[PDB]
With several copies, the nearest count.
Chain A
Amino acid sequence: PRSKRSKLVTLAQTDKKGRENKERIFDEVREALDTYRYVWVLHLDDVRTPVLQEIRTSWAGSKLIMGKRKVLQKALGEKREEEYKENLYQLSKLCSGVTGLLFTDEDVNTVKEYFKSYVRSDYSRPNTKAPLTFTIPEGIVYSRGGQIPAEEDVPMIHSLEPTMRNKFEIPTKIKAGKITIDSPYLVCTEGEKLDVRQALILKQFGIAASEFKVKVSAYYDNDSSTVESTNIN
Chain B
Amino acid sequence: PQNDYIERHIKQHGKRLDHEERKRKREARESHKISERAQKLTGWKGKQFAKKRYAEKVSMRKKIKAHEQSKALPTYLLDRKFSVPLPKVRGISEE
Contact = CB atoms under 8 A, between A and B. Distances in A.
The size bracket of the interface on B is 10 to 19
Given A6-B31, A162-B20, A166-B20, A11 B63 contact: yes
Nearest to A165: B17
Contact of A161 (B14, B64, B67, B71): B14
B81 interface: no
Contact of A11 (B12, B13, B20, B64): B64
Interface of B is mostly: helix
Interface string B39-80: 000000000000000000000000110010001000000000
Contacts, number: 23
A148 interface: no
Interface in A146-161: 158, 161
Interface residues of A, number: 12
Nearest to A159: B14
Give the top 4 A-B pairs by smallest Cβ distance, nearest first.
A176-B12, A11-B67, A177-B11, A162-B20
Interface of A: 6, 9, 11, 13, 158, 161-162, 165-166, 174, 176-177
17 contacts: A6-B31, A11-B63, A11-B64, A11-B67, A13-B71, A158-B11, A158-B12, A158-B14, A161-B14, A162-B14, A162-B19, A162-B20, A165-B17, A166-B20, A166-B21, A174-B14, A176-B13
